Amino acid sequence: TNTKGKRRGTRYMFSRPFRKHGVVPLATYMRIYKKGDIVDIKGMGTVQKGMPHKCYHGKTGRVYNVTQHAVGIVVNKQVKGKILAKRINVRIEHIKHSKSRDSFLKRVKENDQKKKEAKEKGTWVQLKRQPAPPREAHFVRTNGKEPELLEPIPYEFMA
Template sequence: MTNSKGYRRGTRDMFSRPFRKHGTIPLSTYMRVFKNGDIVDIKGHGAVQKGMPYKAYHGKTGRVYNVTPHAVGVIVNKRVRGKILPKRINVRIEHVHHSKCREDFLRRVKENELKLKEAKAKGVYVNLKRQPKAPKPAHFVKQIEEPIQLAPIPYEFVA
């Protein structure tokens, strides 16, 4: 099958179930609540063929724009040649998960609000910007033994 161009070609590992995760789908999958504006990760579930996203959208993150009883509509960015186009796809809920990409941002927003409140009470300026990790401070390295001089062994031709 050298030139096979099937719809699901090249998805042997992509849609396969993880080790010891075959069998019945847990009910918690169907109990998740999706609302318009939620950020979701698309991950095709190999055991459910209905409403499965095309392989190009596997692993992408998008925003929910429509909710139906068994599926959600998601807006996903897709690169088509030189352009990035917002694509609207309908995917069953087995194939989407709530994204954790905003958790760190929301946690930082809460921390910054607390810092700002404390600083305003004291009347002090506080810098809320993230700073890159500083280089390690200067220190002395202890010399345990004398350094050994290493050199390559000269090449000898053995006939």
């Protein structure tokens, strides 16, 4: 049976990238975090205090409590057929904003921009995203050159 250590099997996951060792960049330390910000978790091996557990690596949660040097994040963990909404205290070095949420917050702006605009013009502008539709009928121009013929090459033993 395997051991039950906190950092068992974390040889590559908590390791630093190639030629990215040394001093932690200082823009992480001076990035703000509010309540309810969608946040993804990625462990860092330089700072050993406040490391999240290996089950929270790559996961994404939301912030509920903000302390001096760390934030509390509500995360979802699958424990044998059920999902537990648990709370962890993770230091700031391990924390980035999740860029999955901003696309919805981006899109809402143009939905609201195109709702107040063109309402006085009456033009119904489509707002729902649509999946990639089948392409419409079009004409392909073969002006000049005829479509050249392709031949299956004869086999030759490369090795």
